[PDB]
Symmetry: C2
Subunit: 149 residues, 2 copies
């Protein structure tokens, strides 16, 4: 998988909206509770993501927030190719994993948005079986560093 490829989508929990991005090659994720499932919030999130990593292509759903003029303008400005594919054709399974972790730690936080970030942390730091090997957070840095050469 190319080091520049991400998948993005929204999932829902406690009547709130969570935007989730996955770096396909590594399994690293970033997620944010957003106030509304709008193009403005999606574009804001995409600009944050693009300033952090060398984002070349984002695969997204085809809902109005992802097809909005403001997401298109954000992608154009940041040099991101947006890909939609066949309508309703990694991200979904990641929604499920994220929600599982959130459930595991939900009582450890007072507000859902804090729990979301605790769950992202747990996901990105996790080593398979808890012993050695690499975490997703290490894999994304290794892949990107190697691509830079």
């Amino acid at each position: 998988c190319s080091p520049g490829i991400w998948q993005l989508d929204c999932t829902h929990l406690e009547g709130k909206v969570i935007l989730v991005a996955v770096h396909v090659a590594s399994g690293y994720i970033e997620a944010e509770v957003i106030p509304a499932e709008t193009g403005q919030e999606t574009a804001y999130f995409l600009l944050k993501l693009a300033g952090r990593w060398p984002v070349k292509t984002v695969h997204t759903d085809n809902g109005s927030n992802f097809t909005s003029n403001t997401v298109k303008a954000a992608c154009w400005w940041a040099g991101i190719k947006q890909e939609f594919g066949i309508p309703y054709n990694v991200i979904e399974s990641m929604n499920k994993e994220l929600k599982k972790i959130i459930g595991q730690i939900r009582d450890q936080a007072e507000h859902l948005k804090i729990a979301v970030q605790m769950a992202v942390f747990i996901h990105n730091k996790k080593r398979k079986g808890g012993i050695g090997g690499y975490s997703a957070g290490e894999r994304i840095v290794d892949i990107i560093a190697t691509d830079i050469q």
Copy 2:
């Protein structure tokens, strides 16, 4: 400078609050307009940062948002050394870039992210070498061995 060391501070622009984090060894930054200069918002930002990078130490000032029990608890939970005893120069640089592109966006928060992008992708003189975003990835990857 150690790969795990960050500085965090708040700066102000257009009467709004911008939280700024700098990775000291690389010059890479993350920044966001926050609705209030509170411990809750600071802890949310710190937990985001900590989930992305191997954060070992954050240097902060001693204002009420950074000494709040919520920020202390976030650092404890994430295993981060919070030290109260580069970030200023970075506040100014960020503000300079924001000024350069401010008319390109409708809201300050979007302009802030455009400015972070410009900063993190910038090559010295615009020609070759590495950017701050490449430097942090190189430093961390190397530290992993």
